[PDB]
């Protein structure tokens, strides 16, 4: 085992900063490798493949190394390329296309090292492009394949064009013939900003082809990619040439899944750094390679934030560039990209904090500049990206003792209170309060911003002493209050509630009970949990009907209407205790009581949390059934090799079926609600002849888009019913556009 | 297979703290810790209400239950909490991203815990609060003030 880990340490150690020159390390390691080749053939093969698949940010470095070994051995090289091609085949069969891209890139840079003859690579690329000519195949395939080809170009384009420019030109003509007839319906659902200025958010393929065209016009003269093999001239030039076998991409299969299309996130510009190095242009291939390298570095060290920040700060390049802006832009692109970021958002905020720690002299200014820039473009940002921005900002400021120059944003005061900028400011203040106390928010926020600060989080007990005795149930409320101070049992409370004047459901009964209960347990979250759990059988008996569940939700909202966090946590606990099912918490968000608070964040956070709990419950029951089935099968085969369990399996099968049915019903109810509300709004606006684009409509439509983006993985199963019942042709085109975008997202 | 450098996760590793009142040997405690889903959140202020903890640790994923750190006799907060998540992955994410992140201008210390039974929310300290609160000597407004030893 010492041999294997010694080899791994040797191979990995190349690339890191060291006193000796890079060429010396490569030559020395190559010498050690040839010194140990006859006994460690397969070991070094495995290590090289693994490093070709898990270290794209050193893709050049190892490629150079692989040439030196080839210069020392021909059989080694041939077996290495055979291995790599078989690994690529496996990767394409595993539906893991990212490593497929990395492999292709490696092969192309290996072609640069005089290992594989150019014509074979030309044939491989021709097959890739010809994949676009396949019939009745998803466009996300054709897409990925063209993307792999074009992304491989920035590394071996000079060589292939200078060797086979004729076939290259034919291939480019085919690529244009394909790209001119692509479908762009998915772009609006994926753009962070819908505005075309000052930085259009163009699709990744279009931008990549623009970079390729610019590079071609520049005679394939890049200025950023590192090419260590240039110094290794003689050695490599006296190396034999291998030929890759004819490659045929695996045929399309129903179970195959391809990466969904994405949109490049562009928000900076060279004019933003009048002092630093000239930032690469938005259509320069250097900016694509830089973004790709940063993405790989973040994906290779996403576990240790310290190491990730250290790697990002020390990113090497052929020519000096404004690496601070690139890092900030790529991090924000990961955070904001739809449907979901590569990793958990808190990872990105902590990574930014660590990066500021490493480079306090320059990075904080860049972060502040990006913050202001995002604020100034809030008028069109997607609501999902807005939510991510609000969360990030709040947490990130909380870290630095809520110290922002709010006066610089006084503009929100002048414009409409419901406009995106003032709404964002109010939500940020509310979240900041959620991490602090109301007095803190007041003290920090300028006086002129006081109209935006969230309301004080105080309980509103309708049955207070000042409250008039005329309202029914005041005596019952006092009796319940005394009982609560007297540690009364459930039967006592039942007796107390029996003498309530009904105007199997008594809305006044539930109102008085819930009101009193909540009021008494209104000094901390934990007391509220204890009261709900202890007296959860009174809720369960009184809220048998879904109407009762809705009434309990409404009363709970009335009690805590100056504190959204309490709403969220209390409905989370009620749902967990099966006090109210998720459907009831779905029909309560679309109710007329919350119309004034429909666009607030807490409502959508509550909705998302309920969906998440429902999904986790379904997955947990499915996993339990899977474990039971596996145990039954193992016992059966072991006994054979020598009915109660079958009954339990059947029961769990029926339970999982019912859980899936309730999940489906939840999603269907949510979408039906959205459809009804948006249809009514559009009809009213059309009759009034007013502008259809208002902040409320944008918020609602982008929330529907957010639901689709978050839970496409499950809605893929409901696609049929969704298309048959909710999103039909008769529906208004505005609403149907979201469903069409969702369908095109993976087709 | 997979490079061992990438799989390194130094923020989700067991700490050097072993429970002193646990009913069993260290081995079963280690087994439980390797599969637990509960996080002990330390270095909190007495005044910190649980809504903000719920908000923050929900941001790191869904929360199943929260238990505030009550005093042994006064039944008031002592500056520690237990968060019981629904999945192991959420707890790991919270450790990698919530550990060290400020809260009320106070650094939050998150560590694995072997679960929660009755009697686990009252500080083992004979003064009622936390043992560290009885041994520390530095002033801290969020932690009441000088350590119990300083006053008496």
């Amino acid at each position: 085992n010492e041999t294997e880990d010694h080899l791994e340490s040797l191979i990995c150690k190349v690339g890191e900063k060291s006193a000796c020159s890079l060429e010396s390390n490569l030559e020395g390691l190559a010498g050690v490798l040839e010194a140990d080749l006859p006994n460690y053939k397969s070991k070094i093969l495995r290590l090289l493949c693994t490093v070709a698949r898990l270290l794209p940010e050193k893709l050049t470095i190892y490629t150079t190394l692989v040439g030196l070994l080839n210069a020392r051995n021909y059989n080694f090289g041939g077996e290495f390329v055979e291995a790599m091609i078989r690994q690529l085949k496996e990767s394409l069969k595993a539906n893991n296309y990212n490593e497929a891209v990395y492999l292709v890139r490696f092969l192309s840079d290996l072609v640069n090292c005089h290992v594989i003859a150019a014509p074979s690579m030309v044939a491989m690329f021709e097959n890739f492009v010809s994949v676009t000519q396949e019939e009745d195949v998803p466009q996300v395939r054709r897409d990925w394949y063209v993307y792999a080809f074009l992304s491989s170009l920035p590394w071996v384009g000079k060589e292939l064009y200078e060797k086979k420019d004729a076939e290259m030109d034919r291939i480019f003509a085919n690529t244009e013939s394909y790209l001119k007839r692509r479908q762009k319906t998915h772009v609006p659902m994926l753009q962070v900003w819908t505005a075309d200025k000052p930085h259009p958010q163009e699709e990744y393929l279009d931008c990549l082809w623009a970079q390729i065209q610019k590079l071609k016009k520049d005679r394939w003269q890049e200025r950023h990619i590192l090419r260590p093999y240039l110094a290794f001239d003689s050695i490599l030039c006296e190396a034999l040439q291998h030929n890759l076998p004819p490659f045929t991409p695996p045929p399309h299969t129903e179970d195959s899944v391809y990466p969904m299309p994405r949109v490049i996130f562009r928000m900076f510009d060279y004019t933003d750094d009048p002092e630093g190095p000239v930032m690469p242009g938005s259509h320069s291939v250097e900016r694509f390679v830089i973004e790709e390298n940063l993405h790989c570095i973040i994906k290779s060290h996403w576990k240790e934030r310290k190491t990730c920040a250290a790697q990002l700060v020390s990113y090497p390049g052929k020519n000096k560039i404004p690496l601070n802006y690139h890092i900030v832009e790529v991090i924000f692109a990961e955070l904001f990209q739809l449907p979901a970021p590569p990793h958990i958002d808190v990872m990105y905020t902590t990574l930014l904090i660590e990066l500021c720690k490493l480079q306090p002299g320059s990075l904080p200014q860049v972060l502040a500049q990006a913050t202001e820039m995002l604020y100034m473009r809030l008028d069109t940002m997607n609501t999902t990206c807005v939510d991510r921005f609000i969360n990030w900002f709040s947490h990130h400021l909380s870290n630095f003792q809520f110290r922002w120059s709010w006066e610089d944003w006084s503009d929100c005061l002048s414009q409409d209170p419901e406009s995106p900028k003032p709404k964002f400011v109010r939500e940020v203040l509310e979240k900041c309060m959620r991490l602090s106390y109301h007095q803190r928010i007041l003290d920090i926020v300028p006086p002129t911003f006081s109209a935006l600060c969230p309301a004080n989080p105080t309980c509103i007990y309708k049955y207070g002493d000042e409250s008039s005795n005329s309202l029914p149930g005041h005596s019952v409320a006092l009796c319940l209050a005394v009982a609560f101070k007297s540690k009364a049992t459930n039967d006592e409370i039942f007796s107390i509630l029996k003498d309530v004047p009904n105007p199997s459901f008594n809305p006044l009964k539930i109102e008085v009970f819930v009101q009193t209960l909540l009021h008494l347990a209104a000094k901390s979250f934990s007391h509220s949990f204890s009261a709900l759990a202890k007296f959860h059988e009174v809720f369960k008996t009184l809220a048998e009907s879904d109407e009762g569940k809705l009434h309990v939700l409404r009363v709970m909202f009335e009690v805590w209407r100056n504190h959204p966090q309490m709403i969220a946590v209390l409905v989370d606990k009620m749902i967990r205790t099966q006090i109210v099912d998720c459907a009831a918490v779905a029909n309560w968000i679309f109710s007329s009581e919350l119309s004034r608070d429909f666009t607030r964040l807490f409502v959508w956070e509550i909705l998302h949390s309920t969906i998440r709990k429902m999904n986790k419950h379904v997955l947990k029951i499915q996993k339990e059934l899977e474990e039971a089935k596996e145990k039954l099968a193992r016992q059966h085969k072991r006994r054979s090799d020598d009915g109660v369990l079958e009954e339990q399996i059947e029961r769990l099968q029926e339970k999982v079926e019912s859980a899936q049915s309730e999940q489906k019903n939840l999603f269907l109810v949510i979408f039906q609600r959205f459809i009804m509300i948006l249809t009514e709004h559009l009809v009213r606006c059309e009759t009034d002849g007013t502008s259809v684009l208002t902040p409320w409509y944008k918020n609602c439509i982008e929330r529907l888009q957010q639901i689709f983006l978050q839970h496409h993985q499950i809605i893929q199963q409901y696609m049929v019913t969704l298309e048959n019942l909710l999103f039909t042709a008769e529906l208004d085109p505005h609403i149907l556009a979201v469903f069409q975008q969702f369908c095109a997202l993976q087709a | 297979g997979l490079l061992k450098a990438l799989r390194s996760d130094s923020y989700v590793e067991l700490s050097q703290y072993r429970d002193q009142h646990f009913r069993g040997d260290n081995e079963e405690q280690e087994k439980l810790l390797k599969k637990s889903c509960t996080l002990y959140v330390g270095n909190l202020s007495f005044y910190t209400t649980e809504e903000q903890i719920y908000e923050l640790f929900s941001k790191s994923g869904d929360i199943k239950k929260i238990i505030m750190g009550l005093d042994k006799m006064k039944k008031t907060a002592c500056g520690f909490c237990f968060v019981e998540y629904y999945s192991r992955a959420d707890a790991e994410n919270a450790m990698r991203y919530i550990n060290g992140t400020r809260l009320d201008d106070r650094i939050i210390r998150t560590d694995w815990d072997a679960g929660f039974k009755e009697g686990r929310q009252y500080g083992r300290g004979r003064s009622g609060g936390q043992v560290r609160d009885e041994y520390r000597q530095d002033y801290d407004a969020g932690r009441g003030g000088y350590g119990k030893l300083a006053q008496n």
Partner: peptide, 21 residues
């Protein structure tokens, strides 16, 4: 000066609580 009194969970009777859902 934290302008909020510490909460008192004195009788937060938590008997047996599980998540039925």
């Amino acid at each position: 000066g934290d302008p909020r009194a510490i909460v008192e969970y004195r009788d937060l009777d938590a008997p047996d609580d599980v998540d039925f859902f």
